[PDB]
Design an enzyme around this catalytic site. Structure first.
Site, PDB file in Angstrom:
ATOM      1  N   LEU A  20       0.826  -1.198   0.000  1.00  7.56           N
ATOM      2  CA  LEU A  20       0.000   0.000   0.000  1.00  7.56           C
ATOM      3  C   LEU A  20       0.868   1.258   0.000  1.00  7.56           C
ATOM      4  O   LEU A  20       0.686   2.153  -0.832  1.00  7.56           O
ATOM      5  CB  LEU A  20      -0.946  -0.023   1.201  1.00  7.56           C
ATOM      6  N   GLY A  23       6.404   4.806   4.021  1.00  9.96           N
ATOM      7  CA  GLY A  23       7.081   5.933   4.621  1.00  9.96           C
ATOM      8  C   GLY A  23       8.501   5.577   5.014  1.00  9.96           C
ATOM      9  O   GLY A  23       8.948   4.440   4.896  1.00  9.96           O
ATOM     10  N   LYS A  24       9.234   6.585   5.466  1.00 10.78           N
ATOM     11  CA  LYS A  24      10.450   6.308   6.211  1.00 10.78           C
ATOM     12  C   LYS A  24      10.085   5.518   7.461  1.00 10.78           C
ATOM     13  O   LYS A  24       9.100   5.828   8.145  1.00 10.78           O
ATOM     14  CB  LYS A  24      11.160   7.610   6.578  1.00 10.78           C
ATOM     15  N   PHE A  25      10.856   4.469   7.741  1.00 11.53           N
ATOM     16  CA  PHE A  25      10.696   3.625   8.923  1.00 11.53           C
ATOM     17  C   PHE A  25       9.375   2.859   8.967  1.00 11.53           C
ATOM     18  O   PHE A  25       9.065   2.259  10.008  1.00 11.53           O
ATOM     19  CB  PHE A  25      10.831   4.426  10.231  1.00 11.53           C
ATOM     20  N   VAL A  27       6.285   0.479   6.477  1.00  9.06           N
ATOM     21  CA  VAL A  27       5.772  -0.142   5.258  1.00  9.06           C
ATOM     22  C   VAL A  27       4.366  -0.640   5.531  1.00  9.06           C
ATOM     23  O   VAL A  27       4.142  -1.339   6.527  1.00  9.06           O
ATOM     24  CB  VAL A  27       6.640  -1.326   4.798  1.00  9.06           C
ATOM     25  N   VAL A  28       3.428  -0.329   4.639  1.00  6.35           N
ATOM     26  CA  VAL A  28       2.034  -0.738   4.820  1.00  6.35           C
ATOM     27  C   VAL A  28       1.664  -1.765   3.751  1.00  6.35           C
ATOM     28  O   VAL A  28       1.729  -1.481   2.545  1.00  6.35           O
ATOM     29  CB  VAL A  28       1.077   0.467   4.797  1.00  6.35           C
ATOM     30  N   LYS A  43       0.820  -2.207   9.270  1.00  9.84           N
ATOM     31  CA  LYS A  43       1.859  -1.177   9.283  1.00  9.84           C
ATOM     32  C   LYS A  43       3.111  -1.746   9.958  1.00  9.84           C
ATOM     33  O   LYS A  43       3.216  -1.774  11.187  1.00  9.84           O
ATOM     34  CB  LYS A  43       1.342   0.067  10.013  1.00  9.84           C
ATOM     35  N   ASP A 134       1.442  17.154  10.137  1.00  8.06           N
ATOM     36  CA  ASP A 134       1.742  16.502   8.870  1.00  8.06           C
ATOM     37  C   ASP A 134       0.484  16.361   8.019  1.00  8.06           C
ATOM     38  O   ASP A 134       0.447  15.491   7.142  1.00  8.06           O
ATOM     39  CB  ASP A 134       2.400  15.138   9.143  1.00  8.06           C
ATOM     40  N   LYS A 136      -1.369  16.619   5.111  1.00  4.60           N
ATOM     41  CA  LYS A 136      -1.126  16.823   3.690  1.00  4.60           C
ATOM     42  C   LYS A 136      -1.814  15.677   2.968  1.00  4.60           C
ATOM     43  O   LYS A 136      -2.277  14.731   3.608  1.00  4.60           O
ATOM     44  CB  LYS A 136       0.378  16.877   3.380  1.00  4.60           C
ATOM     45  N   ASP A 155      -1.714   8.816   9.564  1.00  6.35           N
ATOM     46  CA  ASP A 155      -0.386   8.765  10.141  1.00  6.35           C
ATOM     47  C   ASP A 155      -0.261   9.821  11.220  1.00  6.35           C
ATOM     48  O   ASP A 155      -0.859  10.896  11.142  1.00  6.35           O
ATOM     49  CB  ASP A 155       0.721   8.990   9.098  1.00  6.35           C
ATOM     50  N   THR A 174      10.578  34.992  33.615  1.00  3.16           N
ATOM     51  CA  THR A 174      10.370  36.345  34.108  1.00  3.16           C
ATOM     52  C   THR A 174      10.545  37.350  32.978  1.00  3.16           C
ATOM     53  O   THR A 174      11.620  37.394  32.354  1.00  3.16           O
ATOM     54  CB  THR A 174      11.328  36.655  35.251  1.00  3.16           C
TER      55      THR A 174
END
Ligand SMILES: CC(C)(C)NC(=O)c1ccc2cc1OCCOCCNc1ccn3ncc-2c3n1
Length: 270
Positions: A20, A23-25, A27-28, A43, A134, A136, A155, A174
């Site tokens: 699907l 992303g970085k780090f 996988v779907v 995920k 994020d 988008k 996400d 202060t």
């Protein structure tokens, strides 16, 4: 979450073909729960990032997903698994769903319906002190491409829980000692999320990224200094309320931006 240590592949089969999304780090991969037949989206999130254990980053995402579990416009988390190297979040699968970016402009009527949905989820997060950071198209899922279905936000890897009035009191300290570049600073807040919603509204109605410049310092320069005109051909068939709605979000001073709550009462969506 309850974290399962039994093998993931004993309960699920992975669907064949392309993933699907990636992303970085993370996988779907679409999968099927064996004793069920039901589709889910699995995920895979590596626990290591640049050699360091980042399990706490995955734990944060679960916590946000769970905070949002009764929010209908946030993807559901079904189950969590753990291997030595990975954590697997089994999330609900929109049968026939799609990323909003691959669905591409939209009719003003369709953006009205979709933005009210986006803004209700965002509004729900913001009353939980969660800022997404994020928002988008790559993170906005449609439960149907044709006809247009419902939005799910999917996400939360850049998301934060934010402090209240402590932001500009105990942190600043202060007042007689504060340096002038602090007084001039604008920190990441809930209004950062609303900028992004104003950018996405613009993109959704016109097919134009408003601040996209020639290079990246142009893009960054347009964000900092460009006062948009809304005079493009693509605006002639758009309603006056649609442009006012965007003008309410793409304000450079964060404090002057509309909140999600006020957006949801803007005449454009009511
Ligand atoms: C942030 C990251 C890119 C890793 N993405 C996610 O965390 C994600 C979670 C669930 C689904 C999709 C996700 O990434 C978007 C890629 O999706 C492309 C369109 N394909 C479909 C079709 C149906 N579904 N149902 C759930 C998801 C989904 N994606």
């Amino acid at each position: 979450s309850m974290v399962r240590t039994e093998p993931f592949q004993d309960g699920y089969s992975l669907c064949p073909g392309r993933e699907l999304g990636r992303g970085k780090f993370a996988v779907v991969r679409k999968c099927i729960k064996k004793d069920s037949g039901k589709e889910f989206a699995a995920k895979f999130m590596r626990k290591r990032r640049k050699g360091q254990d980042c399990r706490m980053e995955i734990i944060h995402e679960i916590a946000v997903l769970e905070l949002a579990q009764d929010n209908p416009w946030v993807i559901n988390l079904h189950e969590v698994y753990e291997t030595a190297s990975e954590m697997i979040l089994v999330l609900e699968y929109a049968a026939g769903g799609e990323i909003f970016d691959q669905c591409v402009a939209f009719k003003e009527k369709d953006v009205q319906r979709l933005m009210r949905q986006i803004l209700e989820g965002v509004h729900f997060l913001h009353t939980r002190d969660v800022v997404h950071l994020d928002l988008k198209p790559q993170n906005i899922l449609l439960t149907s491409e044709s006809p247009l279905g419902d939005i799910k936000i999917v996400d939360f890897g850049l998301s934060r829980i934010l402090k209240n009035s402590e932001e500009l009191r105990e942190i600043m300290g202060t007042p007689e000692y504060v340096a002038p570049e602090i007084l001039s600073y604008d920190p990441i807040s809930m209004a950062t999320d609303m900028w992004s919603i104003g950018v996405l509204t613009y993109v959704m109605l016109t097919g134009i990224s408003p601040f996209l410049g020639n290079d990246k310092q142009e893009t960054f320069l347009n964000i900092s200094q460009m006062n948009l005109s809304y005079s493009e051909e693509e605006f002639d068939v758009l309603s006056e309320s649609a442009v006012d709605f965007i003008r309410t979000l793409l304000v450079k001073k964060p404090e002057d931006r509309a909140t999600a709550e006020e957006c949801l009462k803007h005449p454009w969506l009511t």
